């Protein structure tokens, strides 16, 4: 029948209590899983949430039990990281005609950018021509925009690769898809394997290859799975590499911006920093060199969540300011300002939040007195502002902006990253009673700009912010158990998550779930055969423009009613959360 191909590969819903014995649970990609720790994240109070996420973040460093999937500390992952570092080095020793590209969609692309800058600086501060560049699905404006739909084209990915790789004779392409998912990277990786004489692709994400996305790509003949499998085959002969540790499911199912984003930095910063450090010392990179860095990153998790109680407060605030339809500002300096922006803009697609509910700010790029005029007038008693800076920053520029905002707001708090024995000028101190400071024990730093203290600082911030924004929204009832049900479908991945959530939550058959979801999307049009057989982009295109789609489809299924009857129910409820929740009992 119409729509069998389109949906052949979707796993059928299990009968009740079979979910584990059907073989389904074991088929759920790790990146999409329900993390058992967060089953009741929707009941947790603010301080628990922080524990829970802090604990979810911990899993990055958790070791492989005795049978199971390789992890970040496993010998095979470290051996691959060493080989890849080894291959970076061949390129480092020959900067003329060489290039290194870090490429991904969404937050994977955000990470690629942050990184590529730093390693450009490293080389620059040593007067070397920088060989790093990045690629973000949707071109460079994607870096700081919510643009979920751009990831779904493999040709786009390839065209942007060919742009950036024109003159060159040695290109290393680090393809980054947490889920081993994005058609953007799929194309690049494949392009590479077509031209190894020039190209060396390194796939990075956090599912085993056997869970890699197997869906038809609309402009491409192979799947991510096939590309990823072919890479793995080239790995013996060292012409491609797959770097894919399990780090455990996200605390918020499918939210790869969080642990997936962190692990991406932890993993690549490590390998690259080691690759550099060691060329200059004339030694081959070693499992022992990477391990230094990994353990430092692991310490940083302890250091960061050491401040858990002051993280929870800031959450309790960010949520209360949002509860009262107020706004939240995330002002920060340098690299940290950027992480501030990236997080605010991620709450758009993640939580169907307006660009303003969590806004981020660099000194988006508004310098001192441009932020005093432009933004400072229209704040309020109820808003929250967060300040994020090191004790190495223009702390004069800081105290100035905090001063004005104290009159216009009292719900300020702050994040400051200090080396040990660095002191907090007394004006600032008195402005923040219950401050959050992180002190970094001294480290025997090699290079010019102390990059390892950079990578530390960025990560620690991302953790805090990811945790705040994310838990804030939870406190507000927008999350259902540990799933975000009411997402805007803006690409094919999101479309599949929507459908898997309908199966999980209704527990009805896939065919019924598909029909209700596609009805929900296409309303007022009824299911025709064209619609049933349409490619997934066409559903996306139409859903992307609509509101409450997934909830309305779930309700149609629950009451076993039509869309018309489900809309009219949802309009007659106080809220969406409540309506869905009621219907689920
Ligand atoms: C936990 C929950 C809600 O049941 C869930 C949520 C999301 N996805 C699943 C799921 C279960 C079993 C298999 C697959 C496969 C998935 C997807 N593979 S696919 O697009 O080629 C095929 C489904 C259309 C997939 C695989 C890897 C990464 C992302 C995705 Cl969407 S998601 C998923 C389950
Ligand atoms: O790196 P992946 O699996 O290819 O995912 C890339 C993007 O879809 C992903 O970054 C998404 O934007 C984030 O909202 C996850 O919360």
Curated annotation (Swiss-Prot):
Task: Give the originating organism.
Answer: Homo sapiens
Domain SIS spans what residues? 88-284, 318-478
The domain-related comment in the record is: Fructose 1-phosphate and fructose 6-phosphate compete for the same binding site.
Keyword Nucleus in annotation: yes
| Self-association state and partner proteins as the record states | Interacts (fructose 6-phosphate bound form) with GCK.
Residues reported to bind beta-D-fructose 1-phosphate: 107-108, 151, 177-179, 346, 493
Q: What is the effect of changing residue 425 to L?
A: Protective factor against diabetes type 2; correlated with high triglyceride levels and low fasting plasma glucose levels; the mutant protein is less efficiently regulated by physiological concentrations of fructose-6 phosphate
Residues annotated for beta-D-fructose 6-phosphate binding in this entry: 107-108, 177-179, 493
Which residues does the annotated region (Important for interaction with GCK) include?
197-198
**Gene Ontology biological-process annotations:** carbohydrate derivative metabolic process; intracellular glucose homeostasis; negative regulation of glucokinase activity; protein import into nucleus; protein localization to nucleus; response to fructose; response to glucose; triglyceride homeostasis
Swiss-Prot/TrEMBL keywords: Carbohydrate metabolism, Cytoplasm, Mitochondrion, Nucleus, Repeat
What does this chain do? Regulates glucokinase (GCK) by forming an inactive complex with this enzyme. Acts by promoting GCK recruitment to the nucleus, possibly to provide a reserve of GCK that can be quickly released in the cytoplasm after a meal. The affinity of GCKR for GCK is modulated by fructose metabolites: GCKR with bound fructose 6-phosphate has increased affinity for GCK, while GCKR with bound fructose 1-phosphate has strongly decreased affinity for GCK and does not inhibit GCK activity.
Outline the segment boundaries, as ranges, of region: Essential for interaction with GCK.
Answer: 442-444
- The protein's name is Glucokinase regulatory protein
């Amino acid at each position: 029948m119409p729509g069998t191909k389109r949906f052949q590969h979707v796993i059928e819903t299990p009968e009740p209590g079979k979910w584990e014995l059907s073989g389904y649970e074991a088929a759920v990609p790790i990146t999409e899983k329900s993390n058992p720790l967060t089953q009741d994240l929707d009941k947790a109070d603010a301080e628990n949430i922080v524990r829970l996420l802090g604990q979810c973040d911990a899993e990055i460093f958790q070791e492989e039990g005795q049978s199971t999937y390789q992890r970040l500390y496993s010998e095979s992952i470290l051996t691959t990281m060493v080989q890849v570092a080894g291959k970076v080095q061949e390129v480092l020793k020959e900067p003329d005609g060489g290039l290194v590209v870090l490429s991904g969609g969404g937050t994977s692309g955000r990470m690629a950018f942050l990184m590529s800058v730093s390693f450009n600086q490293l080389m620059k501060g040593l007067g070397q021509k920088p060989l790093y560049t990045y690629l973000i699905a949707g071109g460079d404006r994607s870096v700081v925009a919510s643009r979920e739909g751009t990831e779904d084209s493999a040709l786009h990915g390839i065209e942007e690769l060919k742009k950036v790789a024109a003159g060159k004779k040695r290109v290393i392409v680090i393809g980054i898809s947490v889920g081993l998912s994005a058609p953007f990277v799929a194309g690049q990786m494949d392009c590479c394997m077509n031209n190894t004489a020039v190209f060396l692709p390194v796939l990075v994400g956090f599912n085993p290859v056997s869970m890699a996305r197997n869906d038809p790509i609309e402009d491409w003949s192979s799947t991510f799975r096939q590309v990823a499998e072919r890479m793995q085959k080239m790995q013996e002969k060292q012409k491609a590499f797959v770097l894919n540790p399990a780090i455990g499911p996200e605390g918020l199912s499918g939210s790869s911006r969080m642990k997936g984003g962190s692990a991406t930095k932890i993993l690549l910063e490590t390998l690259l920093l080691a690759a550099h450090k060691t060329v200059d010392q004339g030694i081959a990179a070693s499992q022992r060199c990477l391990l230094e860095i990994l353990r430092t990153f692991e310490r940083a998790h302890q250091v960061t969540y050491s401040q858990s109680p002051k993280i929870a407060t800031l959450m309790k605030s960010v949520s209360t300011s949002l509860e009262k339809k107020g706004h939240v500002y995330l002002v920060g300096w340098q690299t940290l300002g950027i992480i501030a922006i990236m997080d605010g803009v991620e709450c758009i697609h993640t939580f169907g939040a307006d660009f303003r509910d969590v806004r981020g700010f660099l000194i988006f790029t508004f310098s001192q007195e441009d932020f005093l005029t432009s933004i400072l007038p229209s704040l309020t008693e109820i808003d929250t502002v967060v300040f994020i800076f090191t004790l190495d920053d223009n702390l004069t520029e800081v105290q100035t902006i905090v001063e004005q905002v104290k009159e216009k707001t009292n719900h300020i708090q702050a994040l400051a990253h200090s080396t040990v024995g660095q002191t907090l000028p007394i004006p600032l101190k008195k402005l923040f009673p219950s401050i959050i400071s992180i002190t970094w024990p001294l480290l025997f730093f090699e290079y010019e700009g102390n990059f390892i203290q950079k990578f530390q600082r960025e990560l620690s911030t991302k953790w805090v912010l990811n945790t705040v924004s994310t838990g804030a929204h939870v406190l507000l009832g927008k999350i259902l158990q540990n799933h975000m049900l009411d997402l805007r479908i803006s690409n094919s991945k999101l479309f599949w998550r929507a459908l898997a959530m309908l199966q999980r939550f209704s527990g009805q058959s896939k065919a019924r779930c598909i029909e209700s979801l596609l009805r929900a999307i296409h309303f007022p049009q009824p299911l025709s055969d064209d619609i049933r057989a349409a490619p997934i982009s066409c559903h996306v295109q139409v859903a992307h423009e609509k509101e409450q789609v997934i909830p309305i489809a779930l309700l149609s299924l629950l009451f076993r009613c039509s869309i018309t009857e489900a809309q009219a129910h949802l309009a007659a409820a106080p809220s969406v959360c409540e309506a869905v929740r009621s219907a689920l009992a």
